[PDB]
Structure 1
Amino acid sequence: GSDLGKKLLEAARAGRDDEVRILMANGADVNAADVVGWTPLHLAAYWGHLEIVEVLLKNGADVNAYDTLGSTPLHLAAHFGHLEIVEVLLKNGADVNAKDDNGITPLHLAANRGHLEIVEVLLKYGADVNAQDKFGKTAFDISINNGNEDLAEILQ
């Protein structure tokens, strides 16, 4: 990578909007990835930094960038209950049916943590409700196992 690529990964994670702003002006690599394959957008999505997610996507960040285990920023945002970021990523063309190495989708992760608003947004953008993981489990199979009767009704 590069020196500024490291500072952007740190700034994006930390939630330092002003530092990200200056780094985007100076031309810090938006596609800079750490050893596990996490871009600044991965980190911003994980820690729930909405403005940085939007600024990175404006500066040509790969919305469908995946780590060394095949997980995308939408996977992270959907799993940790960041509703606004999930909407932004999906508007900027995030693959709603993105499968990691385990066959897990953003819908599976949202269903597992009982993020009802996010599950509805994924279904609104055409989330495959019948999509199975490596163990042949759907988002509905997770809801009945978790005992989330509200979520199970949405997924029908």
Structure 2
Amino acid sequence: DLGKKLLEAARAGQDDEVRILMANGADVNATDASGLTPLHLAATYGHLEIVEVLLKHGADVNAIDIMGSTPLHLAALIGHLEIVEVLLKHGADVNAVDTWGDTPLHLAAIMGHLEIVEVLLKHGADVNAQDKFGKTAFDISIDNGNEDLAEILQK
């Protein structure tokens, strides 16, 4: 079972191991206990090379774990702009909602990733998307007094 070894390789960023494991039939869409796939882990820890390799060999760009998190969710949370670019280029759901009602725009704005906020917006990010508490990305900026973010959300 190269599944758990591919998940561990994508997390660590060992590109060579990812190439060999995939060459021995490793399930590119393998999942751990919580439902995370190799693409989730590669995007969470900023392994752009591993993200593309996975997306070039049949990785589900909109896969969700038990909590409803998509690869774009985690990339927009950690602040990996380049990975956000690639994910969106391969059909990532820009308005995917997780178990907490959060969209990628919610997480990027909460973590102050202004540039990623712009990219998500230019790709059709829903500014009226509410979370479990009814807060949109703009509500968060107004509640935390982030003028820079507030100006961006008013394109």
Q: What is the distance in 1 between the residues matched to 2:120 and 2:26?
A: 31
Deviations 1:46-89 (A, max 9, x none): 11110000000001000000010111110000010000000000
- Secondary structure, counterpart of 1:84 in structure 2: helix
Q: Are residues 1:60 and 2:58 paired?
A: yes
Q: TM-score, normalised by structure 1?
A: 0.97
Q: What is the distance in 1 between the residues matched to 2:8 and 2:144?
A: 35
Give the aligned partner of residue 112 of structure 1. Answer: 110
Deviations 1:18-38 (A, max 9, x none): 111111222210111000000
Give the aligned partner of residue 24 of structure 1. Answer: 22
Q: What is the distance in 1 between the residues matched to 2:80 and 2:104?
A: 12
Identity over the aligned pairs, expressed in percent?
86
> 1:52-91 counterparts in 2 under 5 A?
52-91=50-89
Give the aligned partner of residue 126 of structure 1. Answer: 124
Give the aligned partner of residue 11 of structure 1. Answer: 9
Once the 2 structures are TM-superposed, how far is the Cα of residue 14 of structure 1 from its aligned partner? Answer: 0.3
Q: What is the distance in 2 between the residues matched to 1:27 and 1:86?
A: 27
Give the aligned partner of residue 98 of structure 1. Answer: 96
Give the aligned partner of residue 34 of structure 2. Answer: 36
Once the 2 structures are TM-superposed, how far is the Cα of residue 124 of structure 1 from its aligned partner? Answer: 1.0
Q: TM-score, normalised by structure 2?
A: 0.97
The CA RMSD over aligned residues, in Å, is: 0.7
Task: Structure 1: give runs of 5+ residues left out of the alignment.
Answer: none
Give the aligned partner of residue 147 of structure 1. Answer: 145
Q: What is the distance in 2 between the residues matched to 1:145 and 1:76?
A: 23
Give the aligned partner of residue 138 of structure 1. Answer: 136
- Letter of the 2:118 partner, please give it: E
Q: What is the distance in 2 between the residues matched to 1:23 and 1:53?
A: 15
Deviations 1:97-128 (A, max 9, x none): 00001111000000001101100000111000
